[PDB]
Structures are given as structure tokens and as C-alpha cells.
Amino acid sequence: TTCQFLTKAVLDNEREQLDSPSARIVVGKLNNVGTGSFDVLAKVPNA
Amino acid sequence: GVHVSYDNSIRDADGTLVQFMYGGDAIDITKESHMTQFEFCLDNYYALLKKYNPSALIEHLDVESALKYSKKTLKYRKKHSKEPHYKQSVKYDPVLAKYNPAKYLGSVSENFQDKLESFLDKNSKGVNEKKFRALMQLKYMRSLINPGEAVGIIASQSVGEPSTQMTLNVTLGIPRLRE
Amino acid sequence: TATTLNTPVVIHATQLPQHVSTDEVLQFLESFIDEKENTNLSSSISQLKRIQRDFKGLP
Amino acid sequence: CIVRVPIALYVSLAPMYLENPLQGVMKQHLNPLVMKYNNKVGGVVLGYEGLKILDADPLSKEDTSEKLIKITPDTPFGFTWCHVNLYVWQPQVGDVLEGYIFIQSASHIGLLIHDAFNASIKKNNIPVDWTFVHNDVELGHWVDSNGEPIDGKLRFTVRNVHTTGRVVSVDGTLIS
Amino acid sequence: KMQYFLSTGNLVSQSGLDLQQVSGYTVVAEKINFYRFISHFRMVHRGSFFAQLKTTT
Amino acid sequence: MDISKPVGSEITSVDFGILTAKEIRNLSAKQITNPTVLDNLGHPVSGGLYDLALGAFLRNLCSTCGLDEKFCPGHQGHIELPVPCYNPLFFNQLYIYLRASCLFCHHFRLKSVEVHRYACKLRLLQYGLIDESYKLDEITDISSTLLNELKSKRSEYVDMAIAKALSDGRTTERGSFTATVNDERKKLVHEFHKKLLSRGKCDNCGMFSPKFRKDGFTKIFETALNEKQITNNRVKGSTYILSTEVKNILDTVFRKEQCVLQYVFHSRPNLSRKLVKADSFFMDVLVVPPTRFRLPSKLGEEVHENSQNQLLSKVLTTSLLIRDLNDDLSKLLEDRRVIFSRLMNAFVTIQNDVNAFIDSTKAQGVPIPGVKQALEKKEGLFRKHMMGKRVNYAARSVISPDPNIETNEIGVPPVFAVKLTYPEPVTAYNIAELRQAVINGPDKWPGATQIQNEDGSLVSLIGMSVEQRKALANQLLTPSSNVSTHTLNKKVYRHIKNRDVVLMNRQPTLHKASMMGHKVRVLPNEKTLRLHYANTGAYNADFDGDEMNMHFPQNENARAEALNLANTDSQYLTPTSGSPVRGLIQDHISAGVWLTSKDSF
Amino acid sequence: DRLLNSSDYTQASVCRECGSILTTQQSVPRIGSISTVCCRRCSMRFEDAKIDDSQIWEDGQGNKFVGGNETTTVAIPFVLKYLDSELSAMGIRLRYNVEPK
Amino acid sequence: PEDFQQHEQIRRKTLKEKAIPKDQRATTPYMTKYERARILGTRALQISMNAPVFVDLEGETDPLRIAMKELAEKKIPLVIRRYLPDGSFEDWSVEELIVD
Amino acid sequence: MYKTEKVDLALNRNRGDPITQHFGFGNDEWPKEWLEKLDEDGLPYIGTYVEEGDPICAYFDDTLNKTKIKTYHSSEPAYIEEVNLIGDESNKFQELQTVSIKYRIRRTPQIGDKF
DNA sequence: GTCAAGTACTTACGCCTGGTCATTACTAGTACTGCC
DNA sequence: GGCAGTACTAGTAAAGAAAGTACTTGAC
RNA sequence: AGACCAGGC
Ligand SMILES: Nc1nc2c(ncn2[C@@H]2O[C@H](COP(=O)(O)CP(=O)(O)OP(=O)(O)O)[C@@H](O)[C@H]2O)c(=O)[nH]1
Ligand SMILES: [Mg+2]
Ligand SMILES: [Zn+2]
Ligand SMILES: [Zn+2]
Ligand SMILES: [Zn+2]
């Protein structure tokens, strides 16, 4: 029922934070489960 | 959406909480096979000590604090607990939901705590008694589930794939799981 | 040309611009030329010395 | 009319400058920026001064050398915020600019400003009471109300600033 | 209008006949094998109403 | 995807919103008006569904950005509907507010102190204040002196509770929206809408309104107010209503009750302070899609236009019908009757066109699929094209068993060791084995099929000769002739070698160990995959003609996870029970019964 | 790598202040100028808004008007661009607030 | 300028609130199977894009084998930012985390 | 394995508009590379070896003054077993526009074939 | 106000390969021919 | 020699045997 | 791109 959860989402003006894996594939984000549950920070030597 | 967090507390993608700890003990299914098989691991003690390597894995841990509180409650529960569950004024948390089980050596569940010390008292057998219970707890801590495991996929495939082994007066089988 | 390896992605202003004099320009050019040679921007560098020798010399 | 701007930018860093995070920002995003017009700054960038990389952890002091850059998940290039003081040259209307002659054409006085910046004074901005002698041998000189040949410097106002093309140019009028 | 019936299998009739289904009345006789070819002339289908149906009996 | 063309901007959130008719008169490229698509000799007619302002079309440059088919992304456009018409996605929620409101004072038919009680419980639910919203009910013919006093204390109780919790680290001014406050919000609105529709008389001015009727879609009716209760109308001292009439009612309702609908249509607090309007439920202006997304399906010469044009053609036909019907209003008693009865018939049919464009089931009429039905089910857009996609760099072939494979490998044919390829950027260590991989060519294994230059130039290798092919081998590790691309390096699309990583997969992918990651050992003879017997217990595969997929990953974040994380060595124990799935199956077990017997010497 | 990178990967220009995939579009440059990416919704017609020589751009129609140059590239799936096209036809507006502002 | 400065100083201060200090971090000291598969992965993308290599190359040409070699002698300059469900994080370097 | 496709040169027009495309070679500069696979009538030889890219049949078009060749759109190499000439049922006797052709393919039993 | 009888509405395993078929009536028009 | 009848032509217009909850209506 | 038909596991 994709356009019954579409009307209920726009009549709430709902702002979803793109957390579920089904919502991060629609918009192309990296999935939050597993390897994409953190970031990788490269240390650089100079300031 | 549900997955293990870094709190050892599995929860959904938005942040709502489903369990405070995975199965109450936070250990992976694919690693708890030989965990209660003590007489297997006793006979292979010198071979398992080469891969868990105790003295190289004390230095990033705390051995002192969790083993105390695991004896503060086991002394409490074995003296008490002739009475049923509604009578127990508990006075103590279970030792696994107070300290971090993946950092504090000795934070074990209350069946791995009993079945270790029961096996370590039903018989008496060169490896002594103290080098063995300091290796099962090193094995238990390393058998912790990793933070980030897709639990609810594994939990939906652990029901959905054996459900297709029924095909391919109480109600029974696959029409029961629909209800 | 004009990719994310040539240009900043987002660019803004920290604070409102305030004017400088000839001293702040010439103390810059005794340091910005100093900290550059001592790298194919030399077509911009030659146009810097036509401003460094503007306030000091003559074309 | 040189003015100073402190800016905040969001630039990328390449793995070949993972040993020198400072000059990697220089050779990609700052050195291809000098002597070009920039819309978000205001004029032509003369240079930069004092690059400082905003470190990702808020617990390390700004004295420390080992900073750290967030890596994009797809690509191995790191993105970071940085502070630097640009010195930019912005000409604005109403101001008076010294204009040093570069080309004597019969339709325009197309000159240089500070020996780098081109400028334009059209013939219709030049008033009608000035004349221009022809040049048959080989582009001569404009004759003002002084009756003298023009040479070099001129202090004139700003009519328009055209920046859309290759280099900057300053349109100047002669009414004041 | 008959060659359209044989080439498609669809049953275009303004008074829809006394049987349930409306499509799949003609099937390409293969001649991919003689066992395949003789099998088309003995096959009996119940209907396309009954295929799209979640019963067993 | 190119790993050397990075991106720096990330879409962090989305938020749904009504697209009003003012923006799509400004967003647009060109308003399109005639119900014809293309004239004789294939040209797109101007002002039509195919216009050069709406994007490029069939080897003809765009008139908005001036690009061809390869680069013009397509551009938006709108049409002008002369009547406001119902948006069928919002009709059932409109018919709640179409009813439940007095047609005289333009409030809802409840008392305004109880409608205010939902205007302040929902404000507490926008912030993370689920528990304080039940305390708010504990504040307690009747004059307006204490009703104004009751609304004052409730408004001060909410304003004390928000600023307390927002200062006591609990809720940001963006709100705190979780699942169990979405539970109580949906529980409250469905109690709010249930109680609005249960009203006899307006409790602000005590008289009736006639009952409405929803025949279906495309129509709206209000019934006859009876003779017993028009008496209460006289002591204050059946009919097809239009769509301009209903919009004019709800324009007044949302202004007299602006304080309540700001919290019904907002789950997080409205930081933008926009006004919820009655034009939201209507749509005075349709939006035609860009013409890239409705290109005609070419089948040799059998060219049929995409059927969204065929739905929008019927919208434009009625829209230019109904304007000429309004020309006869400018001409003008008998002629008054017949031209207005057909005008009122045309009011229905233009709604029936905008329904049929949006939803093919909300329009009476084999039918043409509307824009709802290109989203819904399997064969939709989410399930068929978002949750699961066709993929590049992948193969599928029948499997044959193979011993003498090291149990963590798959054996690829030469017909798969030539087509499939991997982007390797050249470095100071690759130029031995990747200079030789580019000399061998696209047909010699190990080989290469393309070179991507630094500049994005993609040089093929199929048509080249071997003497020309060695010249590009020496130009490979060269510095940049451009300042802009000095930090890049050439990518050689090499063939798949003995070190690459491969994701094998077999349907139905029931458990997670039916989709593993293997190494490759490239086999020389035939066109079938070679699987070892220990893997077939976990793929559930027999060799009676099973074929199974072969996905070949394209970057080093994905080679490092089918070797370490989706590795087939790490898939020894299935996580259902902890029991293993990998092991020798049929002949290697019956050999051990004879080999470990007492007879074997 | 399966569902995004090697199926329908695209880098599309996105407006920072709109948050809209299929609004911004190419500007038709002058002779000798470079072309820039520019937004339609947060623009304003030049006859309406009475300027600084660089925010002014032009279509291929000839309608020259000032506009918002607040746009940048975001790596999305291409079916997201088709999602907004069949969702703006419904009258729904998706808004894509990117992170670096 | 003045409006962007408030948008920056709110951004850098809330992100300072999310930073758990180095003594008060309470997650596991063992690098997980998921963190290893990306420390090897993201470093392997860097070496192929001409990063400086801190290990002696014994003729290995696969960049992922280089990153697997660099993990053995703790020569990888990457930091894991272990996010928490509240949004807060912990910063663990690779040399601090112990494997397996 | 015997495969058959129908080359039909009259898929475009209707009702007496003239035959714009003829079989055979015309008088443009068409390359001599496809005499090996084609006869003088623009039709292939019986028994030739045809893989992908080789021409199946040649035809001359009048609205372009050019000999376009159709090509073998299949990756599996085949031999040509027979070529039909299909006339039309009409009172006005017409130049041919329809040629049927039959391919044969050696399916020597590779591994992976189901027995 | 509360409880009904009846409606209206949504779901229904995964992947893969081949083939065929595809708008119809009619209506007004330009041209063909029989005719005086 | 030119008029009108038909036969065609290309032209542009209409197309009855599955299960759960939500829902308004409705007697009372 | 569909409608149907024939399959494969
Ligand atoms: N999800 C589905 N799986 C299928 C379907 N048809 C076949 N299969 C798969 O293919 C396999 C078919 O097995 P069979 O029907 O031949 C039963 P059989 O006793 O002949 O197996 P063997 O003993 O291995 O020969 C089985 O493992 C199924 O998982 C289907 O329609 N859906
Ligand atoms: Mg099988
Ligand atoms: Zn365009
Ligand atoms: Zn009223
Ligand atoms: Zn904008």
C-alpha cells in the first residue's frame, strides 16, 4: 500500500532521518548495519 | 533495521530499543557451539591456549572487578533461591547487565557460571583448576557477538528458511506461524 | 575542468571584509612570493610581481 | 581597493597528500584559485595567508600536529573544513581607479590596472568635446580638452565591472 | 477473426460462452520431439481459472 | 561508479511536502496547452506534450538548456486547469474536513474549547512530551467567562511544559519524534477525526448544516436539510456542489481554525511557520513530467507514444473544451440552460481525467495505468526498480561439479574470464603485470579491454592492432599534461585473474549462506562454473541443470568483504542453530567407510 | 556495489536551498564564458528583480533571469530522479537537504 | 558572515558534545569483524590511489595484500569513529584496537 | 540445431507505393569484403560459414543510392543450409521482397548438457 | 451513545530462458469508369 | 466530349468457486 | 514496455 503510506507521510510533513535500510537504498545512502555502522578517519601528520 | 549497537544492546534503526542484551547473554550462535563442551576443551587445553593466549590479552582488560561481583551474587543466589520468583528481593543485578561483557573478564551468564563450576566440581582432574576457569571466561568473552551484526535478518532467516522444510487437534506447522 | 578536485565544494565567509593599506599588501607580497618558490601557477606569479613592482617600481 | 577576507571552505584531500595535508589543499584548491575572479569572495584572488585545517575530533587542541580527516565511504579521498585568509581585489562602482594606458585604439581606451587587470573605457563614455587624430603610417593618441597627447595614468570612476568571461575587466565612465 | 483466434488464443465474443476462462485456448504444437508432438494431442487442461487458485483439492 | 570521481555532498534527510500551484508556475519550462503530440513529418508541436522546452527529443536540441539527448536531463512543465479539482490522494482526508464543519461560522461543529484541547495535546506530542499530554486533560448553559479561563490555563500549562523540557536537556526545538509518540499521535488524530464526524449541531452557534455525500470520486453532493430542524436555523436572530464551492468553504475553515490544523499536519514542529491552506488538498495545476521520462516505446516502426501522454491528452482536450464552453458565457434563456448543463457535465469529466492520470482505479471507464500504479506492487517501482535492480558486471551459467578446487574457490570459464573486468588504477607496483595485461589485449588471457585515462577519456582495445596496443602500454605510467588532473592515474580495466574475488549466489536466496564470496581459479576448457562439493550443502544445489549467479565486485571496499566478511570459510556454521552446513557429501563419505575400516592395509 | 554503484549510479546536481533533484539545470553561456549549473525554483525573473554581473544567466529560450547558484553534485540512484518525476505529478514535493551548507 | 558564523559555532559545539573523552569510552577494545573488513578495505583504495606506504613491499602487487600486511605491524593511519545510538561517538585508532 | 529467420524487405510501406529496396548490389562504392559470403543476387551461398558480424544478405536502396547489408545478429556461428525465395500472391507480378533462410549449428555435446 | 450488518479494501516464493501478438470501424474523399 | 455511380482509400475517431482489518452506515 | 503461452531449477 505504497500510496497509502505516501499520503499519511505527506499529511504529517514527515521528515525521516534515513535510518532504515529500506530508506537508504531509495536515496542511495550507505546502509547503517554492519560495515556502515561507523566512519573511517584518516590521521594526517601535519597541521 | 535491528542490529547490535556498541552498547551491547540490540535495537532498531531509528533508535528504539528491542532488547537490552542479545538473548540475555550477547554471544554469537556461530561461536557458542563448543562453549559448554568443557571436557572437550579440557582435553584440548594446550592447543586452545595457543589461540586465546591469556597473558597477551590481560593488558587491555580488567580482570579484578567483574570476578568479584560474579561471586557477590552467586553466593547470594546459592544461599537463597529455595523460594519462588515473586518472593526474591534480589538486592543485586545479574552480573552481565552491570559490567561490559566484552571488556571485563569474568562477566558471564548465570548458566555459564553454574555449568562451569558444576563441571568443575562433579569431577576433579598438568592443568589445574584456576588455569581452566580463566580460559573458559576468556573463551566466553571472545565468543561475544560483535557490535553491528545484522540480528533481525539472521533472526528472520532462522525462522523463514526452516519454514520451507515443512514443504519443499491443535493447529500445526506453517498455518500456525501465520497466526 | 571545474571538478571537486579543482574547486572547493562549499565556500562561505567567516567575517565581513575590512580594508587594508599598501603596507599590508607589500608585507603580503614579501611573504607570499617568499612562501611560494622558497606548481604551474607561475602565470599567476608573474602577474603578482607586476603588482609587487607596482608599489615599488615602474613597468 | 584590496580587501581582506577570512573564509570557511569545504575541500577534498587526495591520498598522495596523506603525508602533507597542508600543501595538498594548496596545490588543488588554492593555487588554481589565485589571479582568477571568484563570485563567493567578491573579486580577484591575489593570494592566501595562514591555512588552518579544522580537525575532526573536538578533543585535540589546535597546537597538535596529528589531525584527522573523514574519508568518504565510496572513494578514498578525504573531505575537511579549513580556514584561510584570502587577500582579494574587488573594484566597486563609485570608486576612482588609477588607469595606466596599454592599448590606444580608436574605439576604446583598453588599458591595464596595476599592470595586471584589464579595463575598458568606451568611446561613448568619452565626451564629445575630445578629439582623436588619425594615424596613416602606423593607433595614435586621443586629444582631450587640454589639447595634449594622453600618456599613462588616469584617475577615473567605475561604471561597471564585467567578470563573466576569461579575465576581469572594469568599465569606466568620464562623468563625475 | 478465426486466424486471430488461433494465433492468439483469446476468445472475443459479445455473448461470452458457457466456460470460465477467456484466454489460452490455442497452444503452439512444438515439433521439438515426436514424444512432445504426440503429447499435445492427448493433453487435457482444466482451465486458467484453476491455475491462479491457491487450493489443493 | 568511478572511485576517482568523488562526491562531497550527502543527502541527509528527506521531508515530504505538498507542491503548491505557485511554485510550479515558477519551476516550469513552458506551459503546454494543445492536445496534440506531434504533427506530420515527426516534429514535436510547440506548446504540446512533446516540446523542445521540456527537454531534448529524438535527435533535436532542447530549448531550455540547449543540449542533446545525452546531456539534457529533461525539464518540468505544467498545465493550467481552469477549475480547481480534487487531488485523489487526499480526497478521503478532505471528505472528513468537508464534513465536520459548520457552514455558517466556519468552525468545526465541536465546541471550540474541546477543539482547543487537541490543539494543545498535539503540541506536546510534537516535542518529546508524551507523558505531559495526559496531565493536560486533568484541568477542569456554560458562559464564555470560564471557558476563556480554561483555555488560558491550558495554554500556559503547555508553554510551561515545553520551555522546561527544552531547557532540561530533553527535547530540541526541532522536536523529539520516536515510534511510541507516533503511536500516541496516530491514536489521538484518529480520535480527533472520529469525534469531528460525530456532530449534530455546531457547539459555537447552535444550528444545523446539511449532510454531505460521497458518491465515489469525481462527484460531491450535499443532501436536503429536513423540515423539523430548519426551525433551529430560524431562531438565530441531492444538490451537486461544485469544486470551487468546496474550496471556498475550506478556505474559511482553515483561517478560523488555523491554531489547530498547524499541529494536525505537523509531526515535528513547524519551524518554517508556513500556513496550512485549503489549496493543499486541491490541485489547480498539473505537472507534466520531463519528456525523457515519457519517451515513446520504439519497436522498429511500431511506434506507440507513452501512455502518460495519452492520459494528459484527455486532460488537455477537456480543458480546451471547457474554455469554449466559457466563451458562450460571454455570449449570454433557453440557451442558458443547455450550455450550462453541459458545462456542469464538463466539470465532472475534467476531474475524471485528473483522476485517471493519477490513479487508474479511481476513474470509471483495458484501462491505462496511472501514476499510482507505476509504484505499488511487485512490478511497481520500489520493489521492481529500487529494492532490487538489474546489475552490471555479473554472469550466470549452469554449474558442473569439480574436485581439485580448494573449497573456497569457483572455477570460471574463458568466456567469463574475458568479458568481466576490473578497474585497476596504475601505480609503481602494477606496471609490471599490468603493462603485460594491456599488451595481451581483450582476447588473450590474462588481458585488458579498456584504458581509462586521467581526463575521463575511456580508450577501448577491441579494434586495435597489437603494434598500436604496445604504444599505449608505454604511455600508461606518464605524468599529467594537465594541472587539473595531476592527482589521478590511469585505470586499466584488466581481465579477471587468479587473485580476484567473486560473489556466487543461487536462488531462492533463503538464508544468508546462499550468497557467499569465493576466490577464482580460471579454468581453460568449457563454458560452465565449477563448484566444489562442500559448498553445495549451503547453496542447496544439485547438478541436474542448476545455474547460479556470479557477481563480480568493482572496488576494494567490496573485495575486502567477500574475502573477510562474506567469506565462504567464515560461513561454516549457519546461524540458525549453530550446526555446520559445509562438508563432503556422497562419495567422500562412502570412501571413508572403506578407508577407515579394519581391512584397509 | 550491487544495488547502487554498478546498476544506476549517477552524479546529479542538487540545489542546497531547494533540495530538489529535477529543478536545477544548465545555463546557456555567452561566447568565451563557461557554463554553470543553476536552479529554476529559487530563481527570480530579471524583469521582476530590478545585480552583480554573475548571478544573471539565461535559458535557450532567451528569457534571461537572475537565479540561485546554490547547487552541487550528489551521488544518487537514477531511479530517485524518476521517483520525483512521478511524485511531483501527484503534487508531492520531496525536499533533499544536503549536509554541507 | 555573521549569520554563517552562528551556523558554524552551533555545528562545532554540538559535535563537541558528542565527543566522548578518551578515558570515558566504554565500548569493546576488540576490533570487530566489520571494522577489520573496512580498515583493510579503505586503506586498499588509498594505496591504489598513490598513498604513501609504510611497509616494505615484497613484490606484492595486490593493494589489498598491502593493507593486510600493514595491519600486521600496526602501520595503518586510520581511526574508527564508533557512533552511538544517541549520535555520540568514540574515536579508537587502529593501533589501540587488538585483533581477534 | 536448425534455426530459421525471415528476411522481409517490405516491412515499411503499404498499398502500391513503389519498391524502394531491391536485392542485389548497386553501383555505389561498396567494399569487396563481402563477396566471400554473398552471391551476385545479394543472397548468401549455400553452405557458407557465418558468425556474428558477417552479412546475411545484401540489398540496394533507391532513396539513398547505397547497398546496405543485413548482418547475422547471433553470437553463435552457423552454417547456411537453404535459402528460399518467397513470391507474393498478386495479379501484378512483383520483384521479390521476402527471403527465408535456414541456419544449422553444430551442437557437439559440451559439458553441462543435460542427459 | 452503543452495537451491530454489510461493505470495501489489501495481500498472496525467488530467479532464469524461449516463442507470438499487437485497433477497428467508418467516413468522407479523390479517382476510376460507365454512360449518353 | 463531360456527367454521376461505385469501389476504393487513406483518413482520423472509439475500444464465473481464496483470506484478513478498516469503514461508514444503521437499527434502535 | 505489456498480454498470453511454453518451460528450467
Ligand atoms: N523457491 C522455489 N524453489 C524451487 C522451485 N522449484 C524448484 N526449486 C528448487 O529446486 C530444487 C528442486 O528439487 P526437486 O523438485 O527436484 C525434489 P528432488 O527429490 O528431485 O531433489 P533431489 O533429491 O535433489 O533430486 C529444490 O531444491 C528447490 O529448492 C520453486 O518453484 N520455487
Ligand atoms: Mg537442481
Ligand atoms: Zn534542456
Ligand atoms: Zn457554526
Ligand atoms: Zn533553489
Numbering used by the authors:
A (entry chain A): 1617 to 1663
B (entry chain A): 1029 to 1153, 1160 to 1202, 1214 to 1224
C (entry chain D): 12 to 49, 80 to 100
D (entry chain G): 37 to 174, 214 to 251
E (entry chain B): 460 to 516
F (entry chain A): 1 to 140, 172 to 268, 312 to 406, 413 to 445, 451 to 686
G (entry chain B): 1090 to 1139, 1153 to 1203
H (entry chain F): 55 to 154
Sentences from the paper on this structure:
RNA polymerase I (Pol I) is a eukaryotic, 14-subunit enzyme that solely transcribes pre-ribosomal (rRNA) from ribosomal DNA (rDNA) repeats. Although all three eukaryotic RNA polymerases (Pol I, Pol II and Pol III) share a structurally conserved 10-subunit core and a 2-subunit stalk, they have evolved distinct structural features, including accessory subunits, and rely each on a unique specialized set of general transcription factors. Since its discovery, Pol I has been shown to exist in two different conformations that differ by the presence of the heterodimer, which can be reversibly dissociated. The form lacking A49-A34.5, termed Pol I*, has reduced transcriptional specificity and activity compared to the complete Pol I enzyme.
In order to better understand the catalytic mechanism of Pol I, we incubated the Pol I EC with the non-hydrolysable nucleotide analog GMPCPP as previously used for Pol II. The Pol I EC was prepared as previously described except that 1 mM MgCl2 was included in the buffer. In the 12-subunit Pol I* EC, lacking the heterodimer, the A12.2C occupies a novel position next to the A135 surface. This new position overlaps with the A34.5-Ct in the complete, 14-subunit Pol I EC, where A12.2C is disordered and only density up to residue 67 is observed. The first area involves part of the A135 External Domain 1 (ED1), which interacts either with the A34.5-Ct (in Pol I) or A12.2C (in Pol I*). The second area corresponds to part of the A135 Hybrid Binding (HB) domain (residues 989 to 1000), which in Pol I interacts with the A34.5-Ct but in Pol I* interacts with the A135 N-terminal tail (A135-Nt), which folds back towards the HB domain. The A135-Nt effectively acts as a switch, changing its positioning to allow or to prevent A34.5-Ct binding to the HB domain. Both A12.2C and A34.5-Ct form similar interactions with the Pol I core, as both interact with two neighboring asparagine residues in the A135 ED1 (N683 and N684) and an aspartate residue (D990) in the A135 HB domain. Binding of A12.2C and heterodimer to the ED1 are mutually exclusive, as A12.2C and A34.5-Ct use overlapping binding sites. In both, the Pol I and Pol I* EC, the downstream edge of the transcription bubble is stabilized by interactions of Pol I with nucleotides + 1 and+2 from the NT strand. In the Pol I EC, canonical binding of Spt4/5 (as in the Pol II EC) is precluded by the A49 tWH, as it occupies a position equivalent to the KOW1-L1 domain of Spt5, and by the A49 linker helix spanning the cleft, which clashes with the N-terminal region of Spt5.
